[PDB]
Ligand SMILES: *[C@@H]1O[C@H](CO)[C@@H](O)[C@H](O)[C@H]1NC(C)=O
């Protein structure tokens with residue numbers, strides 16, 4: 221409305237501002253913030269680590285991969301599926317695999333296929 | 339009366355629904371971002387304050403791993419993924435409503451689709467996705483259903499041993515105390531009753547939204563807690579302003595220290611209250627998830643003799659279904675019906691000897707005495723095949739006279 | 745009386761007593777049938793015989809010894825009241841809650 | 843020993859007692875009344891303090907509904923109120939104490 | 941602070957009472973409404989009633 225300048229959301233935080241010199245409405249969005257998770261095997265095994273930036277689009281932050289948990293750097297996605305070693309996020313687990321001894325990310329396998337002859 | 343018994347002459351196959359929460363939303367907080375934002379001097383003062391941030395982070399991480407473990411305990415009972423045969427014939431039993439639907443990309447059963455349709459910020463608060471996706475939980479449910487349909491209870495106690503479904507339900511009847519001849523005679527009626535009950539389950543779930551009220555209650559409580567925290571972030575707690583940028587752009591350091599102390603104390607108290615409430619709710623969710631795991635082991639992976647544990651009535655089967663942040667159990671039970679009055683006697687006196695039924699009760703139609711099984715009326719001629727003597731006539735109270743054919 | 749109030753429970757003592765009486769009557773007159781469907785009438789000696797058969801003892805054992813088992817049950821039930829009355833620590837959990 | 847067994851030749855019918863808490867007292871607190879009651883400016887500054895009153899009231903209401911649900915779950919197993927027959931004979935078993 | 945401590949303690953005790961009431965409901969279903977094969981669940985000895 222032509223008389224108010226600030227906008228607020230259900231959280232009582234400043235979401236929109238009317239520019240003083242030129243009269244337009246600007247939406248304010250907090251620039252990308254997130255958590256960092258370090259994915260590592262035992263230090264005795266190796267010192268290689270992967271980094272998961274949680275809930276961050278992998279642009280804002282075998283090298284990079286976009287998980288629904290976040291952006292994972294230092295892990296190579298493999299289309300093979302294994303049993304989960306250490307959880308990462310929504311169905312993706314990481315492991316220290318030789319196959320090329322490095323950290324790999326993969327969709328976890330729920331179990332061996334079995335079709336009973338009914 | 340001390341002479342009359344009531345014996346059922348028919349039965350109903352009933353399917354009941356039990357909804358149990360399993361997991362809740364995994365939330366993580368950053369103490370520094372919540373309390374102080376990006377104010378470096380606030381961060382230094384908080385560092386001087388104490389070491390509550392690490393304790394709160396430990397508690398929340400424990401809750402998250404707790405939720406993942408709850409889902410794993412409930413749904414990862416099996417070690418192999420079982421697939422139902424392409425020809426879906428199980429002696430007239432229709433599991434289409436229960437089995438996954440290939441047409442939908444999600445590969446979820448129609449009941450699971452109904453459940454998912456019914457039950458459906460940046461101040462340092464983050465929501466971590468669960469380790470197991472909805473598709474993975476659906477695949478666990480499909481494997482459990484396929485194993486139960488194709489192998490009975492065998493896959494839970496070892497290798498999956500194939501068995502025709504009518505024979506499996508006959509052995510379940512034998513478990514609940516009814517001879518298998520009853521099922522082999524009334525297979526079509528039992529299949530029709532099961533199909534009608536399964537069809538009615540979906541309409542029952544759709545009609546009453548209170549059935550899925552527990553899962554929505556969990557979601558609502560988590561949302562209310564997060565909203566309360568965010569709102570408490572806008573309180574003053576005695577300070578002149580509720581914004582750290584305002585308190586830093588209006589005041590010199592030494593006199594802004596007291597106001598920033600007030601803000602820090604208030605926000606620490608709010609966040610600690612949130613963590614304590616989350617711990618208590620996590621305890622409740624563990625209780626529910628342990629109950630769900632016990633039911634999956636005892637109702638789905640086998641036949642349970644515990645009364646009212648798996649539905650109401652004599653338990654036959656149980657089928658799992660994944661629901662958002664929980665599980666739904668379709669308990670298939672045997673409910674006797676069409677009861678009839680009869681005259682009963684503890685023993686039959688013949689040739690000076692007392693006779694007792696090996697299994698069943700003695701039933702008179704007024705004129706003749708037969709022996710029946712307890713839960714169903716199948717009269718049979720009293721013979722030495724289904725009686726044992728073990729006693730004398732005079733000692734037993736209430737004995738009656740009749741002939742026991744050889 | 746400075747802001748603290750006690751809300752009465754939804755079910756009164758009479759209603760809990762009626763529930764208990766209904767459960768007792770169902771157990772005595774129908775066995776376990778009323779918990780799994782319609783209440784099926786059955787004489788109490790036959791119910792005890794089938795409960796004996798449940799724990800692995802044949803029903804002839806009950807029928808031969810009906811009077812002895814009835815006397816033992818009556819004596820035990822009569823002794824329960826005296827055991828409750830004599831020892832106040834028996835109800836210690838409810839009193840602990842209060 | 844690898845040749846000997848012990849077989850019972852008699853039995854005892856024993857009645858034991860188990861006491862279980864089910865519900866506790868439902869209490870409600872008025873945050874304003876407890877903290878200051880009629881002191882108006884105290885109420886105003888408590889309002890300035892935060893929204894703890896609403897959370898406390900919600901927790902206590904949840905506890906009360908919890909207690910009612912506990913009693914209902916324990917005692918409302920039967921859907922029909924069964925009545926014992928006028929003649930209280932059950933093969934010599936004396937239920938007058940129960 | 942006093943009232944918050946009271947409510948937290950009440951919540952913990954309420955959790956304990958839910959545990960007790962769930963146990964009581966299970967025993968009503970399994971000991972009263974049927975005969976239980978579980979050892980020591982429904983009294984000491986072979987459960988009859
Ligand atoms: C000065 O104020 C007027 C107000 O209408 C605005 O239109 C103008 O853009 C402002 N000056 C500049 C250089 O932005």
Ligand SMILES: *[C@@H]1O[C@H](CO)[C@@H](O)[C@H](O)[C@H]1NC(C)=O
Pocket residue numbers: 276277278279280286
């Ligand atoms: C966020 O991440 C997704 C990943 O698929 C990407 O498509 C999208 O453009 C990103 N948004 C940005 C860059 O803000």
Ligand SMILES: *[C@@H]1O[C@H](CO)[C@@H](O)[C@H](O)[C@H]1NC(C)=O
Pocket residue numbers: 298299
């Ligand atoms: C592995 O999966 C990704 C995602 O579906 C796909 O882009 C990639 O081509 C796959 N690699 C194969 C099939 O070797």
Ligand SMILES: *[C@@H]1O[C@H](CO)[C@@H](O)[C@H](O)[C@H]1NC(C)=O
Pocket residue numbers: 340735736929931
């Ligand atoms: C059955 O109960 C009636 C009660 O009127 C009694 O008269 C009769 O003797 C009883 N029959 C027995 C105990 O065999």
Ligand SMILES: *[C@@H]1O[C@H](CO)[C@@H](O)[C@H](O)[C@H]1NC(C)=O
Pocket residue numbers: 347348349676
């Ligand atoms: C049992 O019930 C079904 C449906 O209620 C009915 O079709 C059938 O005839 C009944 N059987 C007997 C023996 O009454």
Ligand SMILES: *[C@@H]1O[C@H](CO)[C@@H](O)[C@H](O)[C@H]1NC(C)=O
Pocket residue numbers: 426432434435537
């Ligand atoms: C019963 O099965 C048939 C095919 O087996 C299917 O067409 C039908 O839809 C099923 N019934 C229901 C209620 O879905």
Ligand SMILES: *[C@@H]1O[C@H](CO)[C@@H](O)[C@H](O)[C@H]1NC(C)=O
Pocket residue numbers: 344677678679
């Ligand atoms: C058995 O007889 C009694 C007495 O007439 C009656 O009240 C009851 O309804 C009858 N039950 C059945 C199943 O016929």
Ligand SMILES: *[C@@H]1O[C@H](CO)[C@@H](O)[C@H](O)[C@H]1NC(C)=O
Pocket residue numbers: 703704705706
């Ligand atoms: C009882 O059953 C026998 C055998 O079927 C029959 O001959 C007799 O007429 C029946 N009596 C009554 C009253 O139904």
Ligand SMILES: *[C@@H]1O[C@H](CO)[C@@H](O)[C@H](O)[C@H]1NC(C)=O
Pocket residue numbers: 687731732737738739
């Ligand atoms: C039937 O058995 C009873 C035993 O209680 C006996 O007293 C009676 O004489 C018998 N009836 C005969 C032999 O006709």
Ligand SMILES: *[C@@H]1O[C@H](CO)[C@@H](O)[C@H](O)[C@H]1NC(C)=O
Pocket residue numbers: 844845
């Ligand atoms: C019992 O075991 C002992 C072992 O020394 C053996 O000598 C004895 O023959 C066994 N008795 C029977 C009855 O097997």
Ligand SMILES: *[C@@H]1O[C@H](CO)[C@@H](O)[C@H](O)[C@H]1NC(C)=O
Pocket residue numbers: 812851852853
């Ligand atoms: C069992 O004990 C009772 C109680 O003393 C007694 O009356 C009865 O005779 C005993 N039975 C045997 C077979 O000894």
Ligand SMILES: *[C@@H]1O[C@H](CO)[C@@H](O)[C@H](O)[C@H]1NC(C)=O
Pocket residue numbers: 822936938939
């Ligand atoms: C036992 O039964 C008798 C006869 O019915 C009765 O008088 C007595 O009150 C009952 N109970 C006790 C405690 O003896």
